[PDB]
């Protein structure tokens, strides 16, 4: 229901979160889920007009739903405390079935210099595993990115697969003593030995990174870490 | 006061184990109680609910509305590995216009019963031969825990549970890598108590 | 319906004219309390009722649900607007009139629809602002309303009073007289 | 005249014999025409006019809406009646009786509560039931009532008043 999966913003600037409810649902609810907490109510729309604004924390928060369809939640002068997942639910009223969206994860960054895109690399399976278990395990490494805004996926012969994939549930700090440390992530695709040994099968590890936008002023010689995709490929070996 | 206080702390179970997630509430009037599950990578979705007293059952999960103890405890007699998610106990009153009062979540992780373990540590090579080389600790029992390395330039991930759905065979695995030119696959995972029979190619 | 006591545990009102709203509770035709939609506070009209607490946010959200329902009927009913009514006005005193003793004048404006009315007091032709109070729009089974305005005074033999009522159903402002 | 579109919602409770007989009626009104109604004796929404058919039809298809509406007799009407038992129902305001001459006689019974009252005219310990014209009950609006009873007389007259708030009926004499 919600248009951006993750968004990065600099302190002191505004953000806009969008929610497109299911067609015909007149009631719309905004929630906020901080880390290690449950969702908390923000605002409730009934049609084009706002019905309950008690959940908004301060005056920097403001929402609107012109046309009584899409709703926009605007946070001004963002702080590091506004970093959470902003959920959106829609229904036809109370005591009717409510449907929740995937949510948008907002991360407020203090300094833009700390943002980095990931670096993807795929590793071919070991000949010892193929000879011992008759199965091949591919490993994909995504290193050197900040913040935690990556979506990893495997693509076998141009089609996204889900069977036999193992992505770590939580990323890994490359230096845990630092509060703004670069992250690392690994994923595992496991196929049969016969499938990997076919020189016609194509494997590609794809990572979707969410970063800076056009409104963020980048003033450094390094390439701008905008939203992009980093991929790594490998062909089957006989 | 409209509050929901449920269990905290990660709940860790094995296959076919009994699950219980307590949830107590305090509400002024007559509320409706809910249970929400958030699977990894997905959003919230309604698991079960209840609207009157002494009244939900979806996917084998079971919860009974009890006004005597103001409770809505969740229970499952035989948990599955696919139940690993976060469970939220919710509440909505008759004057709340469908607004939901959630509680903190309860993380659940179900360990698979590896019936045919073949643990080993294999070394992999880069497709570009650039970067570095990683090593894979895989096919070990769920009774094995992986520890963080001692060298500052060595990264070791946690256990991930892979499910080859073409064979209904689950297996744990962990990854470790390092740029150090003296990184050996037999010397990694040495801060961890690995199985004795761990095959070292 | 015949009953011993009737209670409107929720008199919700919303009209399109200058987006106006009202939330009151009634019991046996008397107003228990009303929620100030601008100040977000519950105002009790009987002192014994001040021991209770009623969340004013409910009234705000409920009126917003009426606003959504009304906008739907404006489209569906092909914009059928409200019909104006001819209100009846009566002026009287709360206690028997004795010169010099504190008293209150009561101006009753009945059969009000739409709920948009101006009620003012006049003393010998000039307007009176101090000591004036009124109720909300009290509901009727006819689905119309009626409002009561009060005026504290010290009656004397030199001051007459008028109640000036302005309504869309009147061709000219209605004045009702009162003298000791 | 400016055009106006009015919407009303009345959640009403009717009490008889106290809590023995309780009835709940929700009323959705467009301008002055009730379009949708939930009667507790019916058990589901009923479209009073064709304009409220899509609303009543959809609301009766949601089992959770009907459940909350059916339980409202006990959760709203019967619950609030417990608070009325120690506030509005207890209210007792003793009436102030006054007789003024302006060949007529005006017995002014002012400021009382509840509305239950009986006024009788006596002439030398004889109830005068003719020549007595009584105004309707006047609602002051501030939780008090008043009533004026006229007497067509031709010259001791006493005004008899009975009210629940009194231990003994009040009598006021003239001449």
């Amino acid at each position: 229901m919600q248009t951006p999966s993750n968004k990065v913003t600099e302190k002191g600037k505004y953000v806009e979160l969008r929610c497109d409810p299911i067609s015909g649902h007149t009631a719309l609810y905004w929630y906020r889920q901080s880390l290690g907490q449950g969702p908390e109510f923000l605002i409730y729309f009934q049609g084009t007009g706002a019905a309950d604004d008690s959940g908004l924390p301060n005056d920097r928060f403001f929402a609107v739903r012109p046309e009584g369809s899409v709703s926009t939640l605007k946070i001004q002068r963002t702080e590091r405390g506004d970093s959470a997942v902003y959920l959106c639910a829609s229904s036809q009223g109370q005591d009717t079935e409510a449907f929740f969206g995937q949510g948008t994860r907002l991360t407020v960054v203090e300094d833009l210099n700390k943002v980095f895109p990931p670096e993807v690399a795929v590793f071919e399976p070991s000949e010892a595993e193929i000879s011992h278990t008759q199965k091949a395990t591919l490993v994909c490494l995504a290193t050197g990115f900040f913040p935690d805004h990556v979506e990893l996926s495997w693509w076998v012969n141009g089609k996204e697969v889900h069977s036999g994939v193992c992505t770590d549930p939580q990323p890994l700090k490359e230096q845990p003593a630092l509060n703004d440390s670069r992250y690392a992530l690994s994923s595992r695709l496991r196929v049969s030995a016969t499938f990997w040994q076919n020189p016609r099968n194509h494997f590609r590890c794809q990572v979707q990174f969410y970063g800076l936008s056009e409104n963020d002023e980048w003033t450094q010689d390094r390439a701008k870490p905008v939203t992009q995709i980093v991929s790594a490929e490998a062909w089957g070996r006989a | 006061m409209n509050s929901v206080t449920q269990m905290e702390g990660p709940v860790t179970l094995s296959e076919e184990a009994f699950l219980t997630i307590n949830c107590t509430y305090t509400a002024t009037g007559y509320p409706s109680l809910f249970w929400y599950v958030q699977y990894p990578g997905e959003g919230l979705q309604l698991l079960l609910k209840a609207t009157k007293a002494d009244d939900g059952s979806n996917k084998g999960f079971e919860a009974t509305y009890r006004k005597e103890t103001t409770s809505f405890h969740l229970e499952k007699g035989s948990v599955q590995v696919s139940d690993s998610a976060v469970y939220f106990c919710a509440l909505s009153g008759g004057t709340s216009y469908g607004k939901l009062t959630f509680g903190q979540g309860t993380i659940l992780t179900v360990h698979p019963n590896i019936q045919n373990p073949d643990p080993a540590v294999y070394q992999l090579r880069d497709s570009k031969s650039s970067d570095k080389s990683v090593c894979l600790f895989t096919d070990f029992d769920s009774q094995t825990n992986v520890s963080q390395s001692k060298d500052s330039d060595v990264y070791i991930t946690d256990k991930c549970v892979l499910d080859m759905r073409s064979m209904d065979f689950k297996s744990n695995s962990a990854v470790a890598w390092s740029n150090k030119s003296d990184f050996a696959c037999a010397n990694a995972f040495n801060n961890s108590i690995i199985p004795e029979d761990t095959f070292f190619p | 319906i015949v009953a011993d006591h009737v209670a409107s545990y929720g008199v919700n009102l919303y009209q399109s004219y200058g987006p106006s709203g009202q939330y009151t509770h009634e019991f046996d035709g008397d107003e228990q309390f009303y929620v100030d939609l601008g100040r977000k506070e519950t105002v009790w009209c009987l002192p014994v009722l001040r021991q209770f607490r009623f969340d004013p946010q409910f009234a705000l959200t409920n009126i917003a649900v009426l606003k959504h329902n009304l906008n739907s009927l404006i489209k569906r009913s092909n914009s059928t607007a409200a019909t104006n009514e001819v209100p009846e006005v009566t002026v009287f005193s709360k206690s028997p009139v004795t010169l010099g003793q504190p008293n209150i004048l009561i101006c009753l404006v009945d059969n009000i629809f739409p709920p948009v009315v101006n009620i003012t007091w006049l003393s010998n032709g000039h307007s009176v602002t101090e000591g004036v109070s009124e109720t909300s729009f009290l509901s009727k089974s006819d689905h119309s309303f009626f409002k009561i305005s009060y005026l504290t005074l010290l009656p004397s033999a030199e001051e007459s009073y008028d109640c000036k009522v302005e309504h869309w159903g009147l061709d000219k402002p209605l004045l009702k007289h009162w003298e000791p | 005249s400016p055009e106006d579109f009015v919407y009303q919602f009345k959640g009403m409770c009717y009490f008889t014999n106290g809590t023995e007989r309780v009835r709940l009626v929700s009323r959705s009104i467009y301008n002055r025409e009730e379009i949708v109604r939930f009667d507790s004796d019916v058990g589901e929404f009923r479209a009073v006019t064709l304009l409220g058919l899509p609303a009543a039809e959809y609301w009766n298809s949601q089992k959770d809406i009907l459940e909350r509406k059916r339980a409202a007799v006990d959760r709203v009407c019967r619950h609030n009646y417990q608070l009325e038992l120690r506030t509005t129902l207890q209210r007792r305001v003793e009436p102030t009786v006054t007789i003024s001459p302006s060949n007529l006689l005006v017995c002014s019974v002012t400021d009382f509560y509840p509305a239950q009252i009986k006024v009788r005219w006596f002439r030398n310990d004889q109830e005068e039931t003719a020549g007595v014209v009584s105004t309707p009950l006047i609602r002051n609006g501030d939780w008090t009532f008043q009533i004026l009873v006229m007497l067509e007389m031709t010259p001791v007259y006493t005004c008899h008043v009975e009210h629940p708030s009194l231990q003994s009926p009040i009598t006021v004499e003239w001449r």
Binding site: - | - | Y9, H25, F33, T61, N62, H68 | S28, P54, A55, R75
Partner: peptide
Amino acid sequence: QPFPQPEQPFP
């Protein structure tokens, strides 16, 4: 305390 009746939204 005083418990009210909410209005259901139109579909």
